[PDB]
Design a protein around this ligand. Structure first.
Ligand SMILES: [Zn+2]
Lengths: 98, 112, 26, 42, 27, 19
RNA sequence: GAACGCGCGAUACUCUUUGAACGCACAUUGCGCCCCUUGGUAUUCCAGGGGGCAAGCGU
RNA sequence: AGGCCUGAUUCAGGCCACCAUCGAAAGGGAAUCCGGUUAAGAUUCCGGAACCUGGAUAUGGAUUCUUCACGGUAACGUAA
């Protein structure tokens, strides 16, 4: 005698990027320095592999300042420029002289 | 008599980008893109616009309370009043006919 | 409001029913 | 859950199942074109 | 503009319609 | 329908050889 | 072999992006999953780093 | 060709069907406006003003005797 079940299934299924690498050098053109002096915006050159989170974190770690916003663009010569606007508690000119 | 043009990437007169002309607080005419108008919800039985339900875009219904998109009656927000009334009457009459047919079958099989 | 921290053990769900089924099974 | 065993009736049932499966397979593979359905209609 | 840059060889030999390169056969 | 999916190929073949 | 950079590869007169080319796509530097770890209020959130993913009634 | 659910601990049981992917900067689609500003940048920057999406959470109110609220004949209304 064999005990086999009646209810059978209808289908059978098978059972190197740190703070010193992120920020390469600042931008010291007259427009960038004007932004530093007036708009409280530090202009930096950053690596092409860095996003806004990494740029903000790197600025915070290296320069000990609070970053309000970061706006990045890619320059025609294959390099990335970042505008970092700091919080009103910090003066960008003081950091630039430092 | 100032001429205005699109403010976005699309340069073609497609349904997606439609322009209205408005006078800004600067005293000049400027273009403004208008969104697609919302469509009233329709009854699922007769296709007439549902009464008492606000007309919004599909994703704007996720942000309003349930009273603005339903009706207190049964099937409220899905079917209109007349369709619900027909459904009730039809269901009751069908049940009554089933009872009568069952009685008739019982009688006609009771001969033997 | 002058409270006191503590850890509360919630009552198990469907305890009496499961006990009855186990009793009938055995 | 049936606690029964048959000797040759099981073989007959298995053969019938296999034949039905083959017939269904033939019908499914042949009904790929509507010309066959039209011919089978008449 | 029948051809574009080929990733494997760098030439302007990648047929856009055929999606094949007439210089190195990519892919 | 096509119910043949209830049997994998190897089961079907090994039962066909039984007959 | 190619692209981008300073003969060489971010350690640049260790080995970037690729390529038989390998997580998936690709004329996009587009889209995922898994494990460990660190930071910012932090059990939930966000991000950074490291390492990976081309059963059968047959006997 | 796969995912999910149930279970005082027994791995057992159950549900469902159907195929990757690519293909639109004129199709479908969540949300930003005004004013100012450069030698060269603007719905992107500056000033003001506002929206969308996702997340963790707290407070008030409701959930009216203690347990998922009412009104109008009706269409329907509501802070829940
Ligand atoms: Zn209706």
């Amino acid at each position: 005698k064999k005990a086999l079940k009646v209810r059978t299934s209808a289908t059978f299924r098978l059972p190197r990027l740190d703070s010193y690498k992120v920020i390469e050098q600042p931008i010291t053109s007259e427009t960038a320095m004007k932004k530093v002096e007036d708009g409280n915006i530090l202009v930096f050159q950053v690596s092409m592999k860095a996003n806004k989170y990494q740029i903000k974190k790197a600025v915070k770690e290296l320069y000990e300042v609070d970053v309000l916003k970061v706006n990045t663009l890619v320059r025609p010569n294959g390099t990335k420029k970042a505008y970092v606007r700091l919080t009103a508690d910090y003066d960008a000119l003081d950091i630039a002289n430092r | 008599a100032q001429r205005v043009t699109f403010r976005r990437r699309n340069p073609y007169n497609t349904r997606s980008n439609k322009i209205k002309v408005v006078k800004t607080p600067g005293g000049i005419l400027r273009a403004q893109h208008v969104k697609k108008l919302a469509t009233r919800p329709k009854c699922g039985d007769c296709g007439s616009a549902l009464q008492g339900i606000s007309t919004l875009r599909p994703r704007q219904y996720a942000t309003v309370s349930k009273t603005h998109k339903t009706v207190s009656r049964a099937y409220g927000g899905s079917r209109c009043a007349n369709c619900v009334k027909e459904r009730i009457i039809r269901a009751f009459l069908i049940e009554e006919q089933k009872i009568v047919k069952k009685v008739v079958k019982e009688q006609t099989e009771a001969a033997k | 409001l002058n409270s006191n921290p503590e850890i509360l053990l919630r009552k198990r769900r469907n305890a009496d029913r499961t006990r009855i089924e186990r009793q009938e099974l055995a | 859950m049936i606690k029964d065993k048959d000797s040759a009736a099981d073989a007959d049932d298995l053969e019938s199942e296999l034949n039905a499966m083959y017939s269904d397979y033939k019908t499914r593979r042949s009904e790929r074109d509507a010309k066959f359905r039209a011919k089978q209609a008449r | 503009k029948s051809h574009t840059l080929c990733n494997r060889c760098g030439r302007r030999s990648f047929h856009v319609q055929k999606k094949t390169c007439s210089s190195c056969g990519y892919p | 329908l096509s119910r043949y999916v209830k049997w994998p190929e190897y089961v079907r073949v090994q039962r066909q050889k039984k007959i």
